[PDB]
Amino acid sequence: LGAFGAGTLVAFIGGLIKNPWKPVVPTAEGKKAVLWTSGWTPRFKGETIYLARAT
Amino acid sequence: CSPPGETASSEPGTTPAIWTGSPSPAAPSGEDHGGGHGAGAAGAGETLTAELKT
């Protein structure tokens, strides 16, 4: 019963569990985690990111 | 507690230099090209201007 409950709970919750620190967002310094990177992170070295006003 | 990194009284700074962006190596596989033409020479393309002065 303990093993079955362990397996079932883990299989129930592992779908939800995700790594926050999986490098996914590309960056000039290689793929990085989402929290480190924002829209201002240069995708490639020397990229121009204008401070565009949102009309 | 205060955050480890704060405050800088010295080193007033400098005016940022004029930004000179670089062509995208990642987004563009190669170099973006403008006018298209046969250009049976070293290469001139489909864009050629000139200003005739006095």
Ligand SMILES: CCCCCCCCCCCCCCCC(=O)O[C@H](COC(=O)CCCCCCC[C@@H](C)CCCCCCCCC)COP(=O)(O)O[C@H]1[C@H](O)[C@H](O)[C@H](O)[C@@H](O)[C@@H]1O
């Ligand atoms: C007693 C049980 C002993 C086992 C402990 C289990 C905890 C250790 C986990 C071991 C696996 C880690 C290495 C390999 C795996 C790995 O790297 O995955 C990580 C995440 O680990 C997972 O897989 C899922 C984690 C499992 C959920 C565990 C639930 C809590 C347990 C401890 C409580 C129930 C046990 C019974 C006790 C309570 C009894 C009741 C009184 C990160 O995911 P990520 O790289 O972002 O990819 C995402 C894919 O995982 C993701 O499933 C997928 O859905 C995507 O969303 C994807 O993005």
